[PDB]
Design a protein around this ligand. Structure first.
Ligand code: 55F
Length: 328
């Protein structure tokens, strides 16, 4: 990397470069190793994510714990898949490694979005009925592009987030969300019908019914695409459940808070979803605006305790794409 180069020039030179692929290793490496960590801004089992500057430009640095090396690899593998780089899918910058044995350091460097995750934004603020759409449409524009199975030269195989939730969604400056945390994600090659997979994963909450009572078929790459939606459905609930309309904007709450204890189990969740087939009670005061209902629609159009029955991702994309025209 030459004197004066800016992260912008890198990314630009990249997108507009021959192949729609990430930056050259040696370069990704140079970046990671010259980043200037600022201060931790979030932790987890996956490790911990910090905020840092690269030659002045802020950046996000997710730092895994050697013990969690595979989680690191998968993301690195995926965020670099042939041509996945939507406007709603976390801009991947680089991945690197550093020591030996017990202390090996694994990093993933992305783009920094001040606002943070939805689960934080939905707690710090109260979106507009207008914003509720940008946020919900983008998420949808994203999960679409992720399942969007292209084919040919370098057709991005269809991918399934396998763990979409209010925390793994980041919101930009212009109130545009973007998918993130593709660690548990899986790919699907259409030219040989394969899946690089392998049990019950994801957050014990937004788990779809198929998985909860185990009666799901992993042979067909749909059981995956499907569960993506239901979960993305629960996420919509939270968004509007925190939307303002003249004063009423019920406190933020995680899906199924009044039914099962905080930090649920597979059993405690399997009872209120499989059995009771109960969903987050959509307050009656919801049938107010023409938009607000479209959500309450999709929200149940997703909460079907039946796989195939759920709406497609690409769909909600088109429907909210239209409801975006007529409104605002
Ligand atoms: C659960 C959770 O917080 N997941 C999660 N993974 C990442 C991340 C960061 C860098 C990177 F390269 C990759 C691939 N992912 C982030 C993330 C990304 C950008 C952020 N920008 C500001 C604040 N927090 C952020 C947090 N959040």
């Amino acid at each position: 990397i030459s004197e004066g180069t800016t992260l912008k020039d890198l990314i630009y030179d990249m997108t507009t470069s021959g192949s729609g692929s990430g930056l050259p290793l040696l370069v990704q490496r140079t970046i990671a190793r010259t980043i200037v960590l600022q201060e931790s801004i979030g932790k987890g089992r996956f490790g911990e994510v910090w905020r840092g500057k690269w030659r002045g430009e802020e950046v996000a640095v997710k730092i895994f714990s050697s013990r969690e090396e595979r989680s690191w690899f998968r993301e690195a593998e995926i965020y670099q898949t042939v041509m996945l780089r939507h406007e709603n899918i976390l801009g991947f910058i680089a991945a690197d490694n550093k020591d030996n044995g017990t202390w090996t350091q694994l990093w993933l460097v992305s783009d920094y979005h001040e606002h943070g995750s939805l689960f934080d934004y939905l707690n710090r603020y109260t979106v507009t009925v207008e914003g509720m759409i940008k946020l919900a449409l983008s998420t949808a524009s994203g999960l679409a592009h992720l399942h969007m199975e292209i084919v040919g030269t370098q057709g991005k195989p269809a991918i399934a987030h396998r763990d979409l939730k209010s925390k793994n969604i980041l919101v930009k400056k212009n109130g545009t969300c973007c998918i993130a945390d593709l660690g548990l994600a899986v790919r699907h090659d259409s030219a040989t019908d394969t899946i690089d997979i392998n049990h019950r994963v994801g957050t014990k909450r937004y788990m779809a019914p198929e998985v909860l009572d185990d009666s799901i078929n992993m042979k067909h790459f749909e059981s995956f695409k499907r569960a993506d939606i239901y979960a993305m459905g629960l996420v919509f609930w939270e968004i509007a459940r925190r939307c303002s309309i003249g004063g009423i904007h019920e406190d933020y709450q995680l899906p199924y808070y009044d039914l099962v204890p905080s930090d649920p189990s597979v059993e405690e969740m399997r009872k209120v979803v499989c059995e009771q087939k109960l969903r987050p009670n959509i307050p009656n005061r919801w049938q107010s605006c023409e938009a607000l209902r479209v959500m309450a629609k999709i929200m149940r159009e997703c909460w079907y305790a039946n796989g195939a029955a759920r709406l497609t991702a690409l769909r909600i994309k088109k429907t909210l794409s239209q409801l975006s025209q007529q409104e605002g």
